[PDB]
């Protein structure tokens, strides 16, 4: 995840 | 608290929180094999204060309409939903209360067999009348009249009335035998020549007396006589112009009715049967009772001042099917409720995929006489010349009997009742001599039409998973096996005039579970009074024609406040009053609705969307519908909706979404959107590719290994890492895999077996002579082998060419807009892409379809955000913002 | 009862030929060796392997 | 009737061949694994 809620891989 | 409590950890300290830290360490260490967490109580205490008000407020509320209105086909009610102050209502609890009277029409019959003479030999005379019939009772004299003597204190005779020969009494009380000996008295009730002579099945005859007599306005003792001996009255049959009826029975061989009025003559040969069963109960989740998705009769929910509506509905968000999906993704659906009528539709998986595995008979199944020996031969004496013994009649040889094939015959009955009658009307024949109604929809006709066992009787697709192709495209849930309908029409009872005390929920998304704030709110909604569009039937017969009615009595809103202590309720008020604290909802299905009429029988259908932004598009989902069963809910009424069964439009049902051969997409003229080539067919979404040299068909079915990578990759998000069966917590009832179904058999070749014939269906001969020729008739056959099913097995098997389908129902195809077709987020990766977020695109995209002669219309969705934000600035004012990012419901032009 | 008996058959707008197999004609088609097929009929919606 | 057929149809018939009996006057292949032999044997319902 991340903090703008869900996702995956634009964060290493 | 009180020390005695903390001593026992009733309300003291947490389990691990009082024990010495060493022991907590120990238990936390060795817990997998030696657990000690179950040996010390950990107290649990509810909040002491400021959680529930003490100021004597209601726990549930009663709301009665301020004003009502009755239309010939609808019902309008306006409520006054006024929540108090320092209290909060969650609209989820709110639910309408409905009372009235409902008439299910003559098409109702919540059973399959027959309640009358239920067990007799379904083909033979209620003793009729000239004479012909029978007598059970025995006597010692028959009087000048008076009757036959039942006998008593130096006298006693019987009552032409009922204590006559009560049709079910007997000499029976003899048994193995009885033998009307020269008792000179047979006797019994024979119907009279003014009463229709229906078969002996069905025969009802309203009781007329009390003792259970049967007459009309009182019956006369005739006096048939001897056995060609002489005047010597021997029999006194009692004759009883009954009022014969037959509710529940449709004949199936009325011999040529001599004329148009033989109520008697020789019709002692009429067969008869049960009537097909139709249960007729209210739609699942009461689908359709309230006016959803119809802009004309839309509801309202606005503060008592500023009546500006706050619920604005469209024709694209299909809020019924959306709700029905929501139950699935947030429930089980295999758990009948009774209040929301939450009984999901369903088809017996042994009825759409009928596996004619064969009969399990290996043993003769016999029928031995009633005593164990009949047709004995009197013998006497011995070759020692007759010592102390015309008597002692020992039956010779071996017992006399006659066998039945129970296992096979029961299976045949199942097949005929379950996957024979529901063939499309084309294959179904009409009885020999019975008239039928002109209309093709009324229950009178389609019940009168009778199937034929010759089409499907233990010699079709033998021992191979295969839905009879004629039944492949017909609705499966219009079926007496429909568990949901089965229960739901089981619930309201049986018969006519069924008063109903129903409760309906709120299915609209922006109102489904909105949290209301103090202030009085007006709340009116419109109810469909149209019988056909609110009640389900197992035959899909038109209801408002043959007879039906739903009269509403009273409609009351019902809500359950949470008795929150006002001390905290006020904080929650002023706290949800904040701008940033605003609520927000979304429709579950969350996608537009686009019907597309297909020509009655056509091969393909293209569609087009003029240039339009797709900022937050997510993917397309579609299916097929049969236009006869999709209501255009853009008007308060639809006189052309004659179909009554399940409606795939908004009832979750889908049963044709396998007839698509394949689909193509293309952006504005030529930009196909599988994409920069990815799929095995770089431009054609393939779903039913029928011939292979490439071997692209996946399962042993006739799918394609790109479609079964596009499905089961957006539904269960599996793929790219091995196709493993998905766990049931992500496989819901309306999911893909749950319903996928391949199958195959072999059919005799047409170019190899040079003895190949084309012996039709009325010229077969198998199991011939122990069945009826054409229909559910009777047994006038013969015996000579057979010759329908060309053996595809054993030593003399013929050649064989294969066939395969992929029956997949109750699921919609999905083509997610994501780049890799993965569930990487509700708002897709490619959806937010720069190219689609700055420059709109038109769309051209077309489908295949197996030609169905019955007119059918497409069904396509665009998986569009349907968000909503609901704010309440002041006590009694509600403000809402609706939105649809790729398919906005309003723009600068309005 | 609608008879396009006085119109220039083509009022309705036309779309690109789908450009895939199958739907461009409905006359009996022939297989590599000669075994024919059905153009737009049933028995073409089943995986008739050999 | 139905229950008896079920018992012989499924449990009274898979007995080892030593319990099954060949029919009165028909011939069977000498190989014990071929279908013709396997079905040729017929079980006695009285046993099950």
Q: B823 to chain A: nearest residue by CA?
A: A7
Chain D partners (3+ C-beta pairs within 8 A) = B
Q: Which of B840, B653, B813 is nearest to B733 (CA)?
A: B653
Which DSSP string do the residues of B645-667 spell out, in sequence order?
A: S--TTTSS----TT---EEEEEB
What is d(CA B651, CA B629) in angstroms, rounded to the nearest whole number? 11
What is d(CA B802, CA B702) in angstroms, rounded to the nearest whole number? 11
What is d(CA B19, CA B9) in angstroms, rounded to the nearest whole number? 11
Query: Measured on CA atoms in the order B883, B884, B889, B890, is the torsion positive or negative?
Result: positive
Chain C partners (3+ C-beta pairs within 8 A) = B
What is d(CA C45, CA C39) in angstroms, rounded to the nearest whole number? 11
Residues of B in contact with A7 (CB under 8 A): 824-825
Q: Which of B360, B409, B793 to mutate to test the interface with D (most CBs of D within 10 A)?
A: B360
B804 and C20 within 8 Å at the Cβ level: the answer is no
Tell me whether B825 touches chain A (CB under 8 Å). yes
Q: Which of B842, B656, B693 is nearest to C21 (CA)?
A: B693
Q: Are B104 and B496 in contact (CB under 8 A)?
A: yes
Token code pair at residue B278: 């139709």
What is d(CA B132, CA B599) in angstroms, rounded to the nearest whole number? 59
* Contacts for B848 with CB less than 8 Å, ≥ 6 apart: B603, B604, B660, B661, B662, B663, B688, C22, C23
Token code pair at residue B388: 């102390």
Q: Which of B108, B433, B520, B515 is nearest to B253 (CA)?
A: B433
Q: Which of B197, B198, B183 is nearest to B236 (CA)?
A: B183
Tell me whether D29 touches chain B (CB under 8 Å). no
C47 and B803 within 8 Å at the Cβ level: the answer is yes
Do chain B and chain C touch with ≥3 beta carbon pairs under 8 Å? yes
Q: Are B12 and B43 in contact (CB under 8 A)?
A: yes
* Contacts for B763 with CB less than 8 Å, ≥ 6 apart: none
Q: Are B548 and B443 in contact (CB under 8 A)?
A: no
Q: Are strands B235-239 and B186-190 parallel, antiparallel or unpaired?
A: parallel
Residue in the structure block whose two tokens are 């077969």: B764
What is d(CA B491, CA B489) in angstroms, rounded to the nearest whole number? 5
Q: What is the CA radius of gyration of chain C?
A: 16
Q: Which of B775, B706, B712, B776 is nearest to B740 (CA)?
A: B712
What is d(CA B276, CA B252) in angstroms, rounded to the nearest whole number? 13
C20 and B684 within 8 Å at the Cβ level: the answer is yes
| Entry field: residues in chain A | 12
Q: Are A7 and B825 in contact (CB under 8 A)?
A: yes
Q: Are D42 and D19 in contact (CB under 8 A)?
A: no
* Contacts for B819 with CB less than 8 Å, ≥ 6 apart: B675, B829, B830
Rounded to the nearest angstrom, the gap between the alpha carbon of residue B686 and the centroid of all alpha carbons in its chain is 32
Token code pair at residue B532: 């056909």
**3-class DSSP state of B628:** helix
What is d(CA B687, CA B656) in angstroms, rounded to the nearest whole number? 13
C18 and B697 within 8 Å at the Cβ level: the answer is no
B846 and C22 within 8 Å at the Cβ level: the answer is no
Beta bridge partners of B91: none
Q: Are B499 and B102 in contact (CB under 8 A)?
A: yes
Token code pair at residue B547: 């007879």
Q: C44 to chain B: nearest residue by CA?
A: B690
Q: B361 to chain D: nearest residue by CA?
A: D5
Token code pair at residue B612: 């339009």
Q: Which stretches does DSSP call E strand in B486-635?
A: 498-504, 515-516, 519-528, 535-537, 549-559, 585-586, 594-597, 604-612, 619-626
What is d(CA B802, CA B749) in angstroms, rounded to the nearest whole number? 9
Q: Are B509 and B585 in contact (CB under 8 A)?
A: yes
Q: Are strands B300-303 and B519-528 parallel, antiparallel or unpaired?
A: antiparallel
What is d(CA B481, CA B506) in angstroms, rounded to the nearest whole number? 29
Q: For residue B102, which phi and psi values (nearest 5 degrees)? A: -125, 135
Q: D39 to chain B: nearest residue by CA?
A: B362
Q: Which of B116, B120, B127, B140 is nearest to B238 (CA)?
A: B127
What is d(CA D43, CA D21) in angstroms, rounded to the nearest whole number? 6
Do chain A and chain D touch with ≥3 beta carbon pairs under 8 Å? no
Q: Are B298 and B312 in contact (CB under 8 A)?
A: yes
Tell me whether B265 touches chain D (CB under 8 Å). no
- Sequence-distant contacts of B888-891: CB under 8 A, at least 24 apart: B889/B312, B889/B314, B889/B316
Q: Are B112 and B486 in contact (CB under 8 A)?
A: no
- Sequence-distant contacts of B175-181: CB under 8 A, at least 24 apart: B176/B370, B176/B371, B176/B372, B177/B371, B178/B138, B180/B138
Tell me whether B360 touches chain D (CB under 8 Å). yes
Residues of A in contact with B824 (CB under 8 A): 7-8
Q: How far is B804 from chain C (nearest CA, A)?
A: 5
B851 and C46 within 8 Å at the Cβ level: the answer is no
Q: Are B636 and B849 in contact (CB under 8 A)?
A: no
Tell me whether B827 touches chain A (CB under 8 Å). no
What is d(CA B405, CA B841) in angstroms, rounded to the nearest whole number? 67
Token code pair at residue B818: 């994501």
Which DSSP string do the residues of B118-187 spell out, in sequence order?
A: TTS-SS--SS------------S-B-SSS-B----TT-----TTSSSS-SS--STTS-S-----TT--EE
Q: Are B887 and B613 in contact (CB under 8 A)?
A: no
Q: Which of B55, B148, B762, B844 is nearest to B429 (CA)?
A: B762
Residues of B in contact with C15 (CB under 8 A): 606, 608, 844, 846
What is d(CA B748, CA B362) in angstroms, rounded to the nearest whole number? 27
Q: Are B51 and B568 in contact (CB under 8 A)?
A: yes
What is d(CA B430, CA B435) in angstroms, rounded to the nearest whole number? 9
Report H helices in D1-48. 2-6, 35-40
Residues of B in contact with C48 (CB under 8 A): 690-691, 801-803
Query: Measured on CA atoms in the order B585, B589, B594, B595, is the torsion positive or negative?
Result: negative
Provide the 10 A C-beta neighbour count for residue B569. 23
B801 and C48 within 8 Å at the Cβ level: the answer is yes
């Amino acid at each position: 995840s991340l903090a703008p809620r869900h996702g995956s891989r634009p964060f290493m | 608290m009180m020390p005695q409590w903390s001593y026992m950890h009733i309300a003291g300290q947490d389990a691990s929180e009082y024990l010495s830290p060493g022991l907590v360490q120990f238990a936390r260490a060795t817990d997998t094999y030696f657990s000690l967490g179950n040996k010390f109580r950990n107290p649990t205490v509810a909040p002491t204060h400021d959680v529930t008000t003490d100021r004597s407020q209601r726990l549930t509320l009663r709301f009665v309409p301020v004003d009502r209105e009755d239309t010939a086909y609808s019902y309008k009610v306006r409520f006054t939903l006024a929540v108090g102050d320092n209290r909060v209502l969650d609209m989820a609890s709110t639910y309408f209360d409905i009372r009235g009277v409902l008439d299910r029409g003559p098409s109702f019959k919540p059973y399959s067999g027959t309640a009358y003479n239920s067990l007799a030999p379904k083909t033979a005379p209620n003793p009729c009348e000239k004479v012909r019939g029978q007598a059970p009772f025995i006597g010692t004299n028959i009087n000048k009249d008076n009757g036959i003597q039942i006998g008593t204190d130096t006298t006693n005779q019987p009552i032409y009335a009922d204590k006559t020969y009560q049709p079910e009494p007997q000499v029976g009380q003899t048994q193995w035998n009885s033998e009307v000996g020269a008792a000179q008295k047979v006797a019994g009730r024979v119907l009279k020549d003014t009463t229709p002579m229906l078969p002996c099945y069905g025969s009802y005859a309203k009781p007329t007396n009390e003792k259970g007599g049967q007459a009309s306005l009182i019956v006369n003792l005739q006096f048939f006589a001897l056995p060609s001996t002489p005047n010597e009255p021997k029999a006194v049959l009692y004759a009883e112009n009954v009022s014969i009826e037959a509710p529940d029975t449709h004949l199936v061989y009325k011999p040529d009715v001599a004329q148009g009025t033989i109520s008697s003559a020789d019709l002692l040969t009429q067969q008869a049967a049960p009537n097909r069963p139709n249960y007729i109960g209210f739609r699942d989740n009461f689908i359709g009772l309230m006016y959803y998705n119809s802009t004309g009769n839309m509801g309202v929910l606005a503060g008592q001042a500023s009546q500006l509506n706050a619920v604005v509905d469209l024709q694209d968000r299909n809020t019924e099917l959306s709700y029905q999906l929501m139950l699935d993704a947030l429930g089980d659906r295999s758990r009948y409720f009774s209040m929301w009528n939450q009984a999901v539709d369903s088809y017996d998986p042994d009825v759409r995929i009928i596996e004619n595995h064969g009969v399990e008979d290996e043993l003769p199944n016999y029928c031995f006489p009633l005593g164990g020996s009949a047709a004995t031969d009197t013998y006497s004496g011995i070759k020692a010349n007759g010592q102390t013994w015309r008597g002692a009649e020992i039956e010779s040889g071996n017992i006399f009997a006659m066998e039945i094939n129970l296992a096979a015959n029961l299976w045949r009955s199942f097949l005929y009742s379950n996957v024979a009658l529901y063939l499309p009307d084309s294959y179904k024949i009409t009885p020999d001599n019975i008239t039928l109604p002109e209309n093709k929809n009324t229950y009178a006709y389609m019940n009168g039409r009778v199937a034929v066992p010759s089409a499907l009787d233990t010699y079709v697709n033998i021992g191979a998973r295969w839905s009879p192709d004629p039944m492949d495209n017909v609705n499966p849930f219009n079926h007496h096996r429909n568990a949901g309908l089965r229960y739901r029409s089981m619930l309201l009872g049986n018969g006519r005039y069924v008063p109903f005390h129903i409760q309906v929920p709120q299915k609209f998304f922006a109102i489904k579970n909105l949290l209301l704030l103090p202030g009085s709110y007006t709340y009116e909604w419109n109810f469909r009074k149209d019988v056909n569009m609110i009640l389900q039937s197992s035959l899909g017969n038109d209801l408002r024609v043959d007879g039906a009615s739903v009269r509403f009595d009273s409609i009351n809103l019902y809500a359950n406040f949470f008795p929150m202590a006002h001390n905290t309720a006020s904080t929650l008020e002023a706290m949800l009053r904040n701008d940033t604290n605003d609520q927000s909802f979304n429709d579950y299905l969350c996608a537009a609705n686009m019907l597309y009429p297909i020509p009655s029988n056509a091969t393909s259908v293209p569609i087009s969307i003029p240039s339009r932004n797709w900022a937050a598009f997510r993917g397309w989902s579609f299916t097929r519908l049969k236009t006869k069963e999709t209501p255009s809910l853009g008007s308060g009424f639809d006189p052309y909706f004659t179909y009554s069964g399940s409606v795939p439009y908004l009832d979750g049902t889908f049963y044709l979404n396998h007839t698509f051969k394949k689909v193509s997409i293309m952006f504005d003229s030529s930009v196909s959107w599988p994409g920069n080539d990815r799929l095995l067919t770089p431009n054609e979404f393939e779903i039913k590719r029928t011939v292979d040299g490439e071997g692209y068909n996946v399962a042993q079915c006739n799918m394609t290994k790109d479609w079964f990578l596009i499905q089961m990759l957006s539904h269960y998000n599996i793929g790219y890492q091995g196709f493993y069966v998905p766990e049931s917590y992500k496989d819901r009832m309306y999911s893909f895999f749950r319903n996928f179904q391949p199958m195959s058999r072999q059919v005799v070749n047409t170019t190899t077996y040079k003895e190949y014939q084309n012996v039709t269906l009325p010229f077969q001969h198998n199991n011939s002579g122990f069945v009826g020729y054409m229909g559910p008739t009777m047994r006038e056959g013969q015996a000579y082998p057979a010759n329908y099913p060309y053996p595809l097995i054993g030593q003399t098997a013929v050649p064989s060419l294969t066939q395969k389908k992929f029956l997949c129902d109750r699921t919609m195809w999905r083509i997610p807009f994501s780049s890799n077709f993965m569930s990487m987020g509700a708002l897709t990766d490619l959806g937010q892409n720069m190219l689609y977020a700055n420059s709109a695109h038109a769309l051209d995209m077309t489908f295949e379809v197996d030609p169905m002669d019955e007119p059918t219309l497409l069904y396509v969705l665009f998986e569009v955000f349907d968000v909503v934000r609901i704010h309440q600035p002041h006590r009694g004012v509600i403000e809402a913002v609706y939105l649809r990012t790729p398919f906005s419901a309003g723009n600068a032009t309005t | 009862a609608v008879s396009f008996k006085g119109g220039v058959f083509s009022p309705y707008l036309t779309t690109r030929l789908p450009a895939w197999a199958g739907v461009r004609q409905n006359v009996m088609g022939s297989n590599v060796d000669g075994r024919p097929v059905a153009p737009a009929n049933s028995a073409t919606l089943t995986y008739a392997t050999v």
